[PDB]
Amino acid sequence: GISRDSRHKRSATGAKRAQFRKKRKFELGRQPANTKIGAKRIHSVRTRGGNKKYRALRIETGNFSWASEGISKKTRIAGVVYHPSNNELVRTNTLTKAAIVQIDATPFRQWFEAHYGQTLGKRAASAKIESSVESQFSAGRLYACISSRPGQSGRCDGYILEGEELAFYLRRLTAKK
Amino acid sequence: TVQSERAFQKQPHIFNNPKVKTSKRTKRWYKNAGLGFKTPKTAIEGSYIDKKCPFTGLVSIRGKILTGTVVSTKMHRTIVIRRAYLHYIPKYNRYEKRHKNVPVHVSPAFRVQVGDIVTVGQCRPISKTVRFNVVKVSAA
Amino acid sequence: GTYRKRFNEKARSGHMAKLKELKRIRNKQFTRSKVSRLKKKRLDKFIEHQLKREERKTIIGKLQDYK
Amino acid sequence: ARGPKKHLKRLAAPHHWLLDKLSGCYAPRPSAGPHKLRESLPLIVFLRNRLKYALNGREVKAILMQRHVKVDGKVRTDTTYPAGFMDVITLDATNENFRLVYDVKGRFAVHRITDEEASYKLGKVKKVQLGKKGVPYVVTHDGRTIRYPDPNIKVNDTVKIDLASGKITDFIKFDAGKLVYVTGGRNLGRIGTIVHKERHDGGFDLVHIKDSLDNTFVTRLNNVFVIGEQGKPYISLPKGKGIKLS
Amino acid sequence: PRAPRTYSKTYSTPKRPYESSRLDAELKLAGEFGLKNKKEIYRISFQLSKIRRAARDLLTRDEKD
RNA sequence: UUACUUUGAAAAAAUUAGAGUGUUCAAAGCAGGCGUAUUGCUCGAUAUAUUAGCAUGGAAUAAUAGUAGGA
RNA sequence: UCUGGUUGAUCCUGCCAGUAGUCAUAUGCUUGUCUCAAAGAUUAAGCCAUGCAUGUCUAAGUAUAAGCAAUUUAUACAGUGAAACUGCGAAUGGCUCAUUAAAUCAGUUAUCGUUUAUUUGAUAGUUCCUUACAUGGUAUAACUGUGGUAAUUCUAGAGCUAAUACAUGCUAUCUCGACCCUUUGGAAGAGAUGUAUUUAUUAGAUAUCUUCGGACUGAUGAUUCAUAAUAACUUUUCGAAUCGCAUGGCCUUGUGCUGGCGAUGGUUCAUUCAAAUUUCUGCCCUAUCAACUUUCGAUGGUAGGAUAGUGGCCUACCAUGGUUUCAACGGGUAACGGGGAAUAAGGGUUCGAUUCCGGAGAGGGAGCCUGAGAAACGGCUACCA
């Protein structure tokens, strides 16, 4: 029932176009897959061509990368924090692209302790990192931006919010609280 | 200001590393749109973020290159130009004036007042109605 | 044409429905049986004349009262 | 229309096939292959309508299935195979090789060809890229992909290709003063030397060409095809040698 | 769906049909040449009219055109 | 600089206008034929901006640019 | 586009008379031969009995038919081959012109903005990495048999058995090279080694001696392009358990090791047949239709969702825009658009349902399944008739 032609719209002049032809399958749409947090479940929609497309209905874990030194780890997603389109999505815990979620820290801090010979909280020039990230580690959860499309690839991948990113989003969260 | 909006603005896939300290506090990626249109230093060294600027965004300028005389400059980042031509009535063997108004997306690298003559280039559908992108101004 | 008087509107039921939709929202701009018409017109004239008759008779009564 | 078409009318055919307008209602729609729809000659239009070695479609199919016809060394059994331009079709039981090349009038001319000349084939280098694992390849004008080319082979060139091995024997650069064959538009079939390449950025590059009687014409880069150096063509030219006269 | 044949009418009745000088003209022609039809006369008349119109247009062209 | 004008490439076949050919003539239809075929010869098989876009030569006509001041 | 008339004879204006053809539509009488050829119309795209119009097999996917052929090398099979599974086609063709007035369509562009069965050309050793590859596994059809119903190309329960269906799944090559002796080199040792999916990161920049022999990345007009590299991730793909004809090479004589022609399939690019969107300009009558569009997306910004993918396409949150006397919006259209047809001296006018091209439709709304390709109708589902 979801179709995306441009012939049901008003013209640019504000005229109204009468129907030209019956609706077509090569301009269809499909129901949005509200990905939520929970045990994994992934339907696979069959797409034009023979192709596939993995809608994620519920996803729990994810692949998140620390950009600053350039590593990637599989973590767990705790819950949505902020979403630049719908505070309703934040309320309902719906993962989509560009979301801000709190993720578990343990794989990252273990890699850190094991790579830089130093614990977190409480070559040292390289071991020196950002105050905000250190604080989040002390708490146990990080702010990370989901940067994939769970309705198109069945995945939550993301990056950990570094300096300017994190500054901006902390201001937004604090101002909206 | 740059970050006046609910999402963060950035050139996607351009990353400024905290652990390395560099002179310019932000890294810009810019290109030239070819066709001898020199890119403006305000774009090279500005601070705005535009997905659609032909010099810093992800749009390529190809196909038709047109000229217009601005008419409204009075919504956000888009303008509406007027193209005036002389249609020809073969029965009366003489002419008649016509125009029609073409919305165009304008990068914030340009200051366009109403009345000045712009050169625009064709790009992929930017919005419902706007296909061209201001690629050079010329004051009037 | 768009709104013609078709042969079978009953078989064209839905076509008529969407045409009525199109018409109503196009002429939202403006809005935002002939012998039956004649019978109604003459009924209006006849009732108005009877009203004239009764009002005239009442004025006759009032004038003969106030003489 | 909800999918590819499988039929071709007779009036709608490419005109250069010289198909009569009354013998039937349909024309051989050429199967997909090396050459485009409109600039290809199917094997039935070549074996029946030009060579007159057949009289029917069923005779043409009998010949092919008896496995006589080879189009660029490989045996082709599809009766609407789109044999194209600069192609080599060999009929061994007749001991003939045919280079398909254009006649002055526009049409495909049969060009009888000897064995040592049927051994190879020219191809207009048309897309040079860098394939997976970093090996670069050229794409010629009839689909052929050729890997590990000479680094000095650039788009719009000619490469002479050994058919027996699918390899590149050598090549010719697109510079002024080469000899040029023309394959599109009003002048196709006209061989001349390439004088100027007026190049527009964003539009179509035009080419100014000059045939042996010093008559000049202007065509597009899409339609130029470099054959050989001055005065020596790499292929054997059909009679008249691409001179349009009165 | 086939390609249509080309046909064409081979004559054309003259402008004003009944005109006594031409009635007698056709009489003399039919009589001395054995014909049978104003239609045969009109066939030749049409052929020749076409020919002479061709020639006239060529004359109005320039020499050596 | 543009309008405008010249030449050019582009505007499917059929249809139209032409050329060739004794379909028995005709309406039509259609594209080679001779040879010492071992290396040659002959002919005819062109045209159809009516606007938009594209390249191009322009001197007029109609618009549109652009000398001064001080010592 | 003219011909006759008035008055003694003449010129205007006028009146009268006089005329035309129409693949125009109806109709009337006649209708012998030869070649050719068309065969719509009630503003009814109104309703249909019956038959037919889409199936398909090569040597090469699966046969123990309780099929046929005997018979002659065929005790696994082997010729021929119904049935059924599997593969493919059924999306083309053919028909009509209802809708549709910047829509269609025509000429002209773009995809640096996307899918593509097929065809065609290229293309996939990963040697190792602790506890069958002389080749895993279970189903199901046809068939045998027991039945149901007024009836249909309806089908239930039970018993068998196959695969190119289904689900699983295993079997060295190079860089340097001390040394050796020098050619024809061989060599201890040092090291490196799939694809696909998703994200992040990085690269893809480029204004003197002599034995005379030898030593001192690309493409575009333009790219976040092609391509390469790092770390991870994946209900995860692929990396041949298939088939025909042959029967050669070797020998440690093992029913050992090798090997020929071609069928099918398979990832990733290229091509081809397509497809989807899109740039510029161009439509008939209407101003006694002058304001239009915006809640209910109208114009734009951002983020997301959706898609093969661009985009108000959709949803949020923002601004308050967009078209218009150069005629927007509305109404009409016995309006599918073009190639073309008729005709006039030109200029124009009228016709184009109708042999080719494009579009749309299959009684009317809507909806979906398969598949590379359908919003299909000689496919399916419900609603009106």
Q: Which residue of C has its CA nearest to A8?
A: C22
Domain at D1-116, CATH homologous superfamily: RNA-binding S4 domain (3.10.290.10)
User: Tokens 């050459």 sit at which residue?
Assistant: D35
Residue numbers 34-53 of E with CB closer than 7 A to any atom of strand F: 50
Cα atoms in the 13 Å half-sphere on the side-chain side of D83: 33
**Domain that includes residue A135, residue range:** 106-140
Instruction: Report d(CA A162, CA A165) in Å as an integer.
Output: 6
CA–CA distance from D198 to each of D140, D194, D195, D205 (Å)?
23, 11, 10, 6
Quick one: CA dihedral A123, A129, A134, A137, positive or negative? negative
Instruction: Report d(CA D181, CA D25) in Å as an integer.
Output: 34
Regarding whether A48 and A14 lie in a shared domain, the answer is no
Angle at A173 between CA A169 and CA A177, to 5 degrees: 170
Determine the 3-state secondary structure of A54 from DSSP.
strand
B57: left (phi over 0), alpha (psi -120 to 50) or beta: beta
Side chain identity at residue A59, one-letter code:
I
Count Cβ atoms below 10 Å from residue E15 Cβ, excluding itself.
7
Cβ density class B87-96: b for 16+ within 10 Å, e for less: eeeeeeeeee
Contact B62 D201 (CB under 8 A): no
Residue closest to G201, CA→C1'?
A70
Cα atoms in the 13 Å half-sphere on the side-chain side of C46: 6
Angle at D27 between CA D24 and CA D30, to 5 degrees: 165
Regarding whether A131 and A91 lie in a shared domain, the answer is no
Which value, in Å, is the radius of gyration of the alpha carbons in chain B?
Answer: 18
8-state DSSP, D42: E
Domain at D121-171, CATH homologous superfamily: Ribosomal protein S4, central domain (2.40.50.740)
Residues in chain A closer than 8 A to B6 (CB atoms)? 84-85, 172
Structure-solving method? cryo-EM
CATH topology of domain D174-244: SH3 type barrels. (2.30.30)
Regarding whether A134 and A81 lie in a shared domain, the answer is no
Contact D59, D40 (CB under 8 A): no
Regarding whether A177 and A123 lie in a shared domain, the answer is no
Contact B18, A126 (CB under 8 A): no
Instruction: Report d(CA B35, CA D205) in Å as an integer.
Output: 15
Q: Please give the backbone phi and psi of residue E46, each rounded to the nearest 5 degrees, phi first.
A: -70, -45
Helical ranges in chain A per DSSP H = 87-92, 106-116, 124-127, 131-139, 150-153, 163-176
Regarding whether A150 and A122 lie in a shared domain, the answer is no
CATH 2.40.50.740 in chain D, residue ranges: 121-171
Instruction: Report d(CA C31, CA D30) in Å as an integer.
Output: 60
Instruction: Report d(CA D2, CA B7) in Å as an integer.
Output: 43
Task: Give the count of domains, chain A.
Answer: 3
Helices A106-116 and A131-139, axial angle in degrees (round to 10): 120
Instruction: Report d(CA B124, CA B119) in Å as an integer.
Output: 17
Pairing state between β B132-138 and D41-42: unpaired
Count Cβ atoms below 10 Å from residue E64 Cβ, excluding itself.
4
Regarding whether A55 and A21 lie in a shared domain, the answer is no
Instruction: Report d(CA D84, CA D87) in Å as an integer.
Output: 6
User: Tokens 């000059």 sit at which residue?
Assistant: D210
- The helix/strand count (H/E) of chain C reads as 3, 0
Instruction: Report d(CA B117, CA B110) in Å as an integer.
Output: 12
Instruction: Report d(CA D9, CA D23) in Å as an integer.
Output: 12
Helices A163-176 and A131-139, axial angle in degrees (round to 10): 60
Contact D22 E3 (CB under 8 A): yes
Helical ranges in chain E per DSSP H = 20-33, 38-60
Quick one: CA dihedral E36, E40, E42, E44, positive or negative? negative
User: From start to end of B16-77, where are the E strands?
Assistant: 65-72
Find the CATH number of the domain harbouring A124: 1.10.168.20
DSSP assignment string, D54-115: -SSHHHHHHHHHTT-EEETTEE---TT-EE-TTEEEEEGGGTEEEEEEE-TTSSEEEEEE-H
Residue numbers 28-87 of D with CB closer than 7 A to any atom of strand F: none
Regarding whether A71 and A56 lie in a shared domain, the answer is yes
- A64, β-bridge pairs: A73, A158
Instruction: Report d(CA A94, CA A84) in Å as an integer.
Output: 12
The answer as to CATH 3.30.70.260 being correct for domain B1-140 is: no
Candidate from B18, B19, B129 with C-beta closest to A12:
B129
Regarding whether A159 and A114 lie in a shared domain, the answer is no
